[PDB]
Design a protein around this nucleic acid. Structure first.
Ligand code: DCP
Ligand code: MG
Ligand code: MG
Length: 515
DNA sequence: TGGAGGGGAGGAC
DNA sequence: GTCCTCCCCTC
């Protein structure tokens, strides 16, 4: 019915449910990504400004580039020498490090491979990286996001998704202060829908009324992706998204004012579109993708099917083959080749996998789950694939890793020396989590993984005992030593020392709430 | 890249 | 039944 909204009361009311808000076509999701994160952390640690060309350095690689340094053409994974050729006033700052034989990490400022003095070197032979300064700042940001929003998923060290559903719903229905103009409040613009909601006489399966003309005065905060110049507010999804953009800006300002960090943000009805949108414009920007602009955005030429989370590896490449996708404009191709429903694509997939020709042992497509795959591709190609936000435990796993150069791990005694660093590092991380979150954090399972001189991988995992935080490092080392000596035996008569990599990972934890 | 963190399949136990 | 090994996803 073109006399009514495309959306129902059900879809609007479900914004107030944390468990179901994501499946609403009115969903309002934000993806927020810290700009040049490790470089910003170092900038703030060193009392530097947004104009200083900082780069964060790990061994000889630039692993984060401030926006000031980007103006010189410096890119992530430039070598430090390459970057110095591009910018005479560069401020390279090495990550913090642990020294082999010590049990604490620190910064050695003024030191690195670009320093002439051999007294101010940070040797790859005798140190390991600590990412803990970045992890600490990430946890501080997470606390601010969770204070502002009831459903936050940490997606990586510098990324979160927010479900703004409750905030948007509540603003839409109950906010009596928000002004659209000097003469018009949100409460008056929305008098019809609020009357209906408070009156309580709607049927959940009925469509909403067409939006009132007065709500078209509501503004989006940020950059609205709109190359075709479409009308900004035409249905209730736009209203919710505009309100969400106002809230998101306030949250991002809290991050900036409290921690000092600039962010980019993407706002849309789905996690996958939000993630693309947050990367569209940087630094310090919010890109908003309206439902009516989804195809304009997805087809702008920046993106392919492999741009979507889960599709950037081997499965994505198999799909390119299986679906005969072109090398460019694959998203539009999927949309137009199976234009009506996902059943069209499922039929195509079922035929491909039913062939005796198809190798189930090497494929990453589950032949029993082609309905799910077809729906996922069908909806992703339209910007309408809604995934829930998880919200994670305090920790799930914890790894300490050292890739080894030359003969720096040439025997079991060297292995154990590095394991001692790993155990000190992990125990310190666990202790910090226990204090910060008021928990008991108990490692249950440990995995040792290593690579030989010939790059062959050897792994072993198993249980670790628990005796309290004061014995944690010892308990971890006990298992580490057992596993490295077990693997040494397994490597007998084979190419082994010197190792090229050794790592320890606590792969399973128990977490106990206190208070 | 190195140095992370997430997640799951399936045979071993 | 759960555990261990190996593999695939991402920043
Ligand atoms: N392969 C990678 C990718 C990233 N990082 C680190 C350094 C980054 O600062 C941080 C977050 O990654 P992003 O991809 O968000 O990159 P930045 O925040 O540095 O830059 P942008 O402003 O483009 O987000 O993780 C890393 O160590 N190894
Ligand atoms: Mg970032
Ligand atoms: Mg990122």
């Amino acid at each position: 019915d073109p006399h009514m909204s495309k959306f129902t009361w059900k879809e609007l009311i479900q914004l107030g449910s944390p468990s179901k808000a994501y499946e609403s076509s009115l969903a309002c999701i934000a993806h927020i990504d810290m700009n040049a994160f490790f470089a910003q952390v170092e900038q703030m640690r060193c009392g530097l400004s947004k104009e200083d060309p900082v780069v964060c350095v790990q061994w000889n690689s630039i692993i984060a580039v401030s926006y000031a340094a980007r103006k010189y053409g410096i890119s992530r994974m430039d070598t430090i020498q390459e970057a110095l050729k591009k910018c005479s006033n560069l401020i390279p700052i090495h990550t913090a490090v642990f020294k082999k034989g010590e049990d604490f990490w620190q910064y050695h400022d003024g030191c690195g491979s670009w320093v002439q003095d051999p007294a101010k070197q940070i040797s790859v032979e005798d140190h390991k990286v600590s990412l803990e300064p970045y992890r600490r700042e990430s946890r501080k940001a997470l606390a601010i996001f969770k204070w502002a929003c009831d459903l936050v998923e940490r997606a990586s060290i510098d990324e979160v998704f927010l479900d703004l559903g409750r905030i948007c719903f509540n603003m839409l229905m109950f906010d009596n202060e928000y002004e659209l103009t000097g003469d018009l409040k949100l409460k008056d613009a929305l008098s019809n829908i609020r009357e209906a909601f408070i009156g309580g006489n709607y049927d959940i399966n009925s469509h909403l009324p067409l939006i009132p003309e007065k709500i078209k005065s509501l503004k989006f905060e940020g950059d609205v992706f709109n190359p075709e110049g479409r009308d900004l507010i035409t249905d209730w999804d736009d209203v919710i998204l505009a309100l969400g953009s106002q809230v998101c800006k306030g949250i991002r300002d809290s991050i900036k004012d409290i921690l000092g960090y600039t962010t980019s943000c993407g706002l849309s009805s789905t996690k996958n579109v939000c993630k693309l949108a947050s990367n569209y414009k940087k630094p310090d920007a919010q890109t908003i993708v309206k439902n009516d602009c989804l195809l304009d955005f997805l087809d702008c030429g920046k993106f392919e099917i492999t741009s979507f989370w889960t599709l950037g590896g081997v499965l994505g490449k198999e799909l390119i083959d299986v679906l005969d996708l072109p090398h460019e404009n694959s998203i539009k191709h999927i949309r137009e080749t199976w234009p009506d429903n996902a059943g069209q694509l499922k039929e195509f997939l079922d035929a491909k996998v039913k062939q005796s020709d198809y190798d189930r042992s090497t494929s990453n497509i589950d032949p029993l789950k082609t309905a799910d795959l077809a729906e996922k591709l069908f909806k992703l190609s339209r910007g309408r694939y809604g995934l829930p936000l998880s919200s994670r435990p305090v920790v799930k796993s914890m790894m300490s890793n050292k890739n080894l150069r030359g003969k720096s791990c040439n025997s079991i005694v060297d292995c154990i020396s590095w394991l001692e660093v790993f155990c000190a590092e992990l125990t310190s991380r666990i202790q910090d989590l226990e204090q910060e979150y008021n928990k008991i954090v108990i490692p249950r399972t440990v995995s040792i993984s290593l690579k030989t001189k010939s790059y062959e991988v050897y792994r072993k995992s198993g249980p670790v005992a628990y005796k309290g935080i004061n014995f944690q490092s010892h308990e971890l080392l006990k298992v580490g030593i057992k596993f490295v000596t077990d693997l040494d035996i397994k490597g007998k008569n084979k190419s082994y020392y010197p190792l090229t990599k050794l790592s320890m990972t606590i792969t399973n934890f128990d977490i106990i709430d206190l208070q």
